[PDB]
Nucleic acid binder design. Sequence first.
DNA 1: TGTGTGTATATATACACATATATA
DNA 2: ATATATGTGTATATATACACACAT
Lengths: 442, 442, 284, 284
Amino acid sequence: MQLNNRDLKSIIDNEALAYAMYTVENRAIPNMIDGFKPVQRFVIARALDLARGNKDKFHKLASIAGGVADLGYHHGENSAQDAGALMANTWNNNFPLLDGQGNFGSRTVQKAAASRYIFARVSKNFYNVYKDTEYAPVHQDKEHIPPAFYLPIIPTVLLNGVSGIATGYATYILPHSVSSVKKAVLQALQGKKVTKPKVEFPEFRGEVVEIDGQYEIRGTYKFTSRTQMHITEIPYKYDRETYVSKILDPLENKGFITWDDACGEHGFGFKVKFRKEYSLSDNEEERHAKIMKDFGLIERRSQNITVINEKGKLQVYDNVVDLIKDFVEVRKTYVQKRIDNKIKETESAFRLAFAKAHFIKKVISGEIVVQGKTRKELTEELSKIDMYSSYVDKLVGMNIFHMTSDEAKKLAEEAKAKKEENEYWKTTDVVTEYTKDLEEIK
Amino acid sequence: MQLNNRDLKSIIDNEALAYAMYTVENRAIPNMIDGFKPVQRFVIARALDLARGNKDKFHKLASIAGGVADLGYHHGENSAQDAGALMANTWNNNFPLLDGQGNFGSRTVQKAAASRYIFARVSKNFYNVYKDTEYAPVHQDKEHIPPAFYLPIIPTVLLNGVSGIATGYATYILPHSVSSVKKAVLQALQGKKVTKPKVEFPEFRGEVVEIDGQYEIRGTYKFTSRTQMHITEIPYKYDRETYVSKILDPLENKGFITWDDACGEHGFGFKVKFRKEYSLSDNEEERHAKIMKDFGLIERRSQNITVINEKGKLQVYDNVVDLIKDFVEVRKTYVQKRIDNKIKETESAFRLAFAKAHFIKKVISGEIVVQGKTRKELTEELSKIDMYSSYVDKLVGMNIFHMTSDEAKKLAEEAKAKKEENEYWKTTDVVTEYTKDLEEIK
Amino acid sequence: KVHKHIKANLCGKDADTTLFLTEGDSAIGYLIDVRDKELHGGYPLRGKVLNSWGMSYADMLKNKELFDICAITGLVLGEKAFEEKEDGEWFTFELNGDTIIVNENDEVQINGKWITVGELRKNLMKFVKIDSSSVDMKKYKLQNNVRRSIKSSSMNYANVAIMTDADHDGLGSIYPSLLGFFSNWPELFEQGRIRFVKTPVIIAQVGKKQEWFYTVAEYESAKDALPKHSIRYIKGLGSLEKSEYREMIQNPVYDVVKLPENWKELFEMLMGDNADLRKEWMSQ
Amino acid sequence: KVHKHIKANLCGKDADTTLFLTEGDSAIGYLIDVRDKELHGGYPLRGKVLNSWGMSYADMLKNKELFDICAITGLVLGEKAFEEKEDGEWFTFELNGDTIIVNENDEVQINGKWITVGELRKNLMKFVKIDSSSVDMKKYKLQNNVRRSIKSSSMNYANVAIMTDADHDGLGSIYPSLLGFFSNWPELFEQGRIRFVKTPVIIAQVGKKQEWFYTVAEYESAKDALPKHSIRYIKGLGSLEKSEYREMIQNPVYDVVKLPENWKELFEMLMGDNADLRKEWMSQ
DNA sequence: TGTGTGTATATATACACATATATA
DNA sequence: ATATATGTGTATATATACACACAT
Ligand SMILES: [Mg+2]
Ligand SMILES: [Mg+2]
Ligand SMILES: [Mg+2]
Ligand SMILES: [Mg+2]
């Protein structure tokens, strides 16, 4: 029974501030490099773990989103289910990082089916653009099994399009086409005028025009003969439920239109015929303005590019070009880390291979006799001699069937051929290898 | 368009008499041997899969479930979580096979927390009771990864109490004391008149009486004064919520009693002060009967022992001890099968070890000149078409720390020890092994 | 005005419109894209249907997915759904050899299609006058060459094709419960107006072509007769299929349900208060 | 008289009676078995608490949880809380080696208790008669001890303890939202009747010794000092064993909340409808 | 002034099955 | 002569916060 007087300003200074920062950094705002909120990196880490044995196996969403608490997820698994279900589809994804089978939703029904059914796996796009997954930064916490953030080749944050809300700060980035983000990254790599990426929406046939920051995602209509029109595409904001009841229902039970459904597999098809009570005129401009205003064929979006940079701190960008220019420079210092790590690893591997070849070539002849020995004397005799102690575990690793023919040839071939890899890693630069890695995205 | 014709009689005889004998067999109606319904069996199979890496680690109940979809449980993962939350309790189970961490429920509130909080692992009781899993029968379906039914030493179905409902058939078995079921199993083994197990409820301090084959469960009430009583215990069927609002609030609203709450560590402890409106006849028998009937301190129940035998067919028993006499008889066969399989496996292991020692002795003596000889014809050579021709790959697959005298003697010692174990396995019987296994359960 | 009812364009008019009662919102997500927008409907139910055998026509209209179905289809409990026309004239069609006796206003089958006999009267074909009192109801009803013309009906959808999951729960618990509910009008199971849309419960990947098994029992009759099958078990109708949904909707295999003479006995035994009839029905 | 109310048997009577607010039904199951059985309440909330700041009392009493809290403790919105008697006398003593100015009727904390001057008059300790020259009423009002007594209270429970889970959401979104709701009665805060039961968020055991960390910040401030530890992150109060729950309840580490002079200004920044204030407050 | 998006907190509701006591 | 409950199963829903640019 303890009595402590806690001033309210201390509560707001510690607990409220900590929760606000936690929502800002670890809940809503995505990473600039990786492109994932700190729930989608959990989902992808678990799904890529599940694909260790079989790469093409489809695993249930209750198995991918389930059991992420051992990776460090401190929240309920239903949030992981709804977050991994939204990133496996194609109606809202310009570059899906999960390929799934089942009802993941469509543009008409922007709601995935229950997690009891739908299966998902890591898509080939992830394997095509997410390289150096073993060189990714390590998080401070020991319980955070996934790395601090993965290391894609192009900025994924601009591709799929994100929208997050946190206390104090919120982010909203529109989707950008892959073929333009790739061009921008390639231009930034060599050093040139970075052409801005073009905003493109998934499964959308309209016209995304930008005037100044604002975007003017449009639709399409077509007068059949004189009064009948065919809305061939509604803006990207709209479902089918919240377009019949939002613009099409409050235009029929008013004495304006009579509409039918022709939403074929192409997309949205709400055929509409106007009755006598309408104010449409022969002027094309006024008719166009009234049609695109009343039917809600124009939506307006403005990006708010707020991302968590490589330092873990929030950052707001004015345009996507700056984001690409900074991301290229951040990834160019990780390509160099890949070069250094590969050089060291190949040197360490060739030394072991050469030691193994030496042991096979000097034991078969009959110099290092192992007959009638024990563990300790062999491990001491091989450690006292040079070139062998640093890999003294190598004594038993090659197994009996290497003390034959057709193995000394192979054992020496590995040592001879690892110098090709080492020399290749000792001459390639960051720009050359990055350019080579960027040509495999198709 | 493939319009066909289907009679109603062909619908309710092929598709209705396939869910009727699916809710009976593959749902409810616990297996007589295994002791679980299919969902419980899948949950424990996944828990064993997780405990393979570490059996002392607690996993989330969203991870203990969820992953049973690939094991062959195509019935939604919320049912699996709900059925696994009812297995880790100590208030409900007289012999839990899952250990829990968190709020899995109490007698006062018979509801576990949400799966987002509670962790579940395999209990020590399962490892002490469930043996011969590797020799358990396999299911007909290849998708049914868990075995057809696990093999415990004692009939766990008569240990925790089960209640199952299905189209046509229902089962209800009371919880029985472990120490009495074990004694009945031992008596059935040795062969003699079997004493029927007694019914014991977990964390219950009352009386259970056999009358005309029924089971009456009575709580205890005491009188601290003329107008004060202490309800020390209530029948097992009740909670705090459904006893206050079904037996107590009626009385309070009727102006008969005034009850204070003491439902603490010692179960339920309601303290009742009587009013002048409530009759308090001095006769001991009439007063006791009125108190017992009015306060709902007596609960009568009758069993319905419906189970599934070893052939996957419904079986209805009459006496309490008529499942032990059948479970023991069947399980003796699965113990003899284990003995035979262990004999074969130990003989094979001893033969392999002896061949390994012989080949090592030959190779360190120069009989097999591995040096200056290709691997393929070395396999074709004296390594094959000899005494150790059956395991030629294994000898070829030996590593280096065996030509040394340290482990050359180790191989011979293992070869001599495996033969000793085989000597054990041929000089033993079913009765001795089963009665030795029963001694582990204290 | 039902919230989840996906209306057809021609719903309420004289057309071969169809309703597509599922057993969940998940199974109907892909229907709005792959269905025929002129003649196809849809209403997702909510789990197992209420056992409505023996209840009066006042407790049936208390479950959500027993009043919604009644209002959407336009059926009203306790009233005849159809209204047949006169049955004076008689004629013969002589299709595939068998003598089909038809009336002046009937509906014949042509490879699974419905065409009115009155319009067929324009061309001679094989129409042969025959005397009255030739009531061969079962003779022409075995493959349904005769559907009495509906003088008037309050039915919005002139088809109630039921599609649910092909698992045991969705085939032996929601199928016969809905059959018993629609049994309140013993005329739907007379013109093939109640249909079962068969759904694959298992899709194997033998060779490079996907093999479809509609029931688990059918699958467990060629399992050890099929080469290198890697099957997928379908638990949900619309949530385990991506383009198989389009094929199964645009190329469906219906089963029109027909009531035998003693349908009441079967329904009472399966859906009844006496649980001892089911113990003697499941044991044989 | 709500459904999910574990009422104490001494609720409507004068005693040290406490109401325990959790954020869910799962955090209550072990409280019913570790309660005091005479002085402890309980009502499980439902997730986040509706933003109380800036709401009219009519809209305040529309959220089910806020209305339930208002109906449980006996508080009324719009009417001030328990009243107080007349003051003006001073009886300063030397408790704990300090001159503590006390009125003729207050409550004095000896060591984690509540004793009043009226009952202190019969225990024979030092009384010093002091005139009304002093006016520093806040000199004793800022601390828990020496609080104004009660003459008539409509409050069923004499204490309100908010026992939420010590995760980020519990301490950041729900606790300083019930704080904002209860700020409608600052007399509760003045008397030290709004407490927070310090629940662990990380119970990490080293060898055989357990360490309770009530916040993530305290764990991270000692993570590099303890030996090799197996962290047990308890997400919610429903993930705690009965021994730990019993130790938490029966050996509670309370945190009495006391409001400063400018509490409205520091509430408008966190709860008001102006995100720029949060932007400026977070960037520091 | 008002929906709206996506990651978090907590929770709830209808229906099927049978049979053996409490109730009417 | 009805009511209730017990445990696997079939589907589903709700209130609440946070912000910032469109639409009123
Ligand atoms: Mg479904
Ligand atoms: Mg189903
Ligand atoms: Mg919380
Ligand atoms: Mg909680």
